[model samples]
Target: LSREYKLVMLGAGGVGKSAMTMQFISHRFPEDHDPTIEDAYKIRIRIDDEPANLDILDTAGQAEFTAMRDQYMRAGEGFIICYSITDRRSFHEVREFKQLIYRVRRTDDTPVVLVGNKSDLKQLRQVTKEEGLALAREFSCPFFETSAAYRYYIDDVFHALVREIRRKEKEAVLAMEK
Candidate 1:
């Protein structure tokens, strides 16, 4: 109850959007969204010993909503814009999604976690790890390569977003102090 975040998942179709969410949740409570309307859930977890509750909304662009997207995105405290390493097209779509995020939120400090999924399929890989890191640098956000099927870095993606939100909150207060 003391800590909570509304996290949104965004990206192109078949980037393992569903797989990532489910993989992360399978470890919550021990680690830690809501149910009902649309694809969403509630999870409770401990992050840095902080009992943080998370409300994750999977914006299944599967892969928009010119109208609903803005309204929907307005509620997100953080985001994970995902793409698959094996798909270059999906990787490019991440930038477009980030564009929508900024247009709606209108800030540079948005807590965003960029993910390259399907890292297990390296033989089929199209996007390189260095390229992903460069993209994250441009986004000014943390990034990771995850194989959701193999549970690689799945928790790290969500947990990092929580840290980002807290990081921004700290910056806001620091700005006030100045």
Candidate 2:
């Protein structure tokens, strides 16, 4: 909602953070053997005819990058907290990330997009759709299940978040008006 928006992607390793970034920014998958580390990229999108630039920081899940994660969280205006649908552990970690988001947001106001990635492997799903939605509802975050493998719900998720962020911004303005 500002001149520029910063988005941070956080999740355990192998949760498709890089994949999602590629899908959203490039609209294509990167070459195979994508590295497991933090990668940053910038992109622009038009929402309601407003061309907004986004600074997306794809952060590593390694414990060694804890400081980097903290810095990213503190600076980010939005967060895409991802988890593999097949990994229960990663699902549980989302709560911890939520707490971190709350701490760094000066107003506890950063918009969070809860992503259940790797939805293509539905047969191997460890978290159900209802459960995932429940988690999002509990955190009061937008919920999206995406698959970079097939690009299914990938762009949809990103656009949904964009609209959500804009809606929240408008709500804040209206609140002040009242």
Candidate 3:
């Protein structure tokens, strides 16, 4: 089936979530880290030899927008939860966002991919690769360490989530046939 998948990028501020989003959408990193309130992008892609589209929501990281998170969560078919390797708080808060996704979606099986961004700054890294993998295992999602600044694994990240989304969609169709 050919269709569009909606995804939400979630994480604390300065975690490079927007940077990754901008990278994926524009194929170029931002010159400055701008605090995003809300933005959306549409991109055409191919998934498993099938034409597909992606609609991404780049959400605000501020606490004041807490209520609005559920809206984005419910609307999304998939999620890209990001944290910076250089920031421990960003790493820690990812769990809360994961739980919130479950709460809002009423399902723990939501298609999700966790990302530890800023891999280029390894010398400043506060979260280890093992820690990121453990978190991904605990959350039941795929994990990736990406250097959005350098365009490392940026395409793979989104493609992985699209594959998951496609898998889930096929599962639903099969379940209905039963």
Candidate 4:
């Protein structure tokens, strides 16, 4: 990999924050549990025909720990703002997450990918596709529906962010070259 990157995960409690992290890191999902720690892991992949390495920061899922969330995201270049498709409260808070990111990060430089997890449970969906897409579009972030439980479209979300990260890096380098 010629360039390195850092990505952070953000979402409400029990919205697969830890599952998504483990799914991306170990490529395996946990049965069910809430992880309450801030940890970092390395993710490797190929994007745009180039090998890439991403440093992912998995933070706690509880709302009381929001200070830590703000701290980690302030240092993160890219982010996955996720919510469970079956959880309306989580989905409703997606905008708050986006707003917090915007306030803490760049006005035009940061990249965020909106994720609607647990897509395998079609009948249990509390947030509709239109709702998710509308919010994602409003924020100008790429959207993906995934199921950490079923592992569907999990890699797709990560890959899109990697491509975006590469694009951001290229723009920065080109700006320097100018």
TM-scores of all predicted structures: 0.87, 0.87, 0.92, 0.87
lDDT of 1 by residue, 75-165 (tens): 7899899999999999999999888887888876778999999999989999999999999999889999999878999988988999989
The residue ranges of model 2 lying beyond 4 angstroms of the native Cα positions read 32-36, 61-70
**How close to the true structure is residue 68 of candidate 1, measured as C-alpha lDDT?**
43
Candidate 1, residue 63: lDDT: 21
Winning candidate number (lDDT): 3
Model 4 regions lying over 4 Å from their true place: 1-3, 61-71, 106-108
**Listing every candidate in turn, what is its Cα RMSD in Å to the true structure after a full C-alpha superposition?**
4.5, 2.5, 2.1, 2.4
lDDT of 3 by residue, 122-164 (tens): 8999999999999899987899999989889988889999999
Q: Which regions of candidate 3 deviate over 4 angstroms?
A: 61-63, 66-70
Q: In order, what lDDT does every prediction score? A: 0.83, 0.81, 0.86, 0.81
True-structure RMSD for candidate 2: 2.5
For candidate 4, lDDT tens digit of each residue in 8-68?
8888877887888888778787765546666778877876677878878777744565765
Q: Where's the lowest-lDDT run of ten residues in candidate 3? A: 61-70
Give candidate 4's TM-score. Answer: 0.87
Q: Which candidate's TM-score is highest?
A: 3
